[PDB]
Structure formats: structure tokens, C-alpha cells
DNA sequence: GAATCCGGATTC
DNA sequence: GAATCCGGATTC
């Protein structure tokens, strides 16, 4: 099943897309903003 | 349908 | 082998 978002690390607190990393900038990528990827989804699924 | 986890293809 | 581009799939 898929993991969800921790909710607690600083990118999971950040409030908005920072509008201006990769995610927030290529038209095709369904990547969530750089800054925001939660610390514990970076580990493999 | 939006958000975005997740993994395949490319490209190095 | 792995970072990056990309988009299918799930969960709401
Ligand atoms: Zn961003
Ligand atoms: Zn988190």
C-alpha cells in the first residue's frame, strides 16, 4: 500500500509550492515541490 | 479531477 | 549505478 505523508518533518509543514525547484517548474512531472517531499518518503518504498 | 507516491526510461 | 525526466496509479 502506499505510504502517506508524515506530517511533522519542515517540508511537510511548508504551506505553499515554492513555485521555482524542478517539480514546481518542469510541465510535465508529477513531482511533488522539492521542498516539500517529506524526510521519511525519501526512504524506498 | 487534484495531488502526488512511486517506478520506468533516458541519459549520463 | 544513479539522478533526472516523465507519467500511471491511488487516495481524497
Ligand atoms: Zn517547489
Ligand atoms: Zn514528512
Known amino acids: 500500500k ?3 505523508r508524515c506530517g511533522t518533518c519542515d517540508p511537510c509543514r ?8 524542478t517539480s514546481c517548474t518542469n510541465r510535465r512531472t508529477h513531482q511533488i515541490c522539492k521542498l516539500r ?3 521519511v518518503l525519501k526512504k524506498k518504498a
Open 2 to 4: 502506499k505510504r502517506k
Open 14 to 21: 511548508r504551506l505553499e509550492n515554492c513555485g521555482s525547484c
Open 37 to 39: 517531499k517529506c524526510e
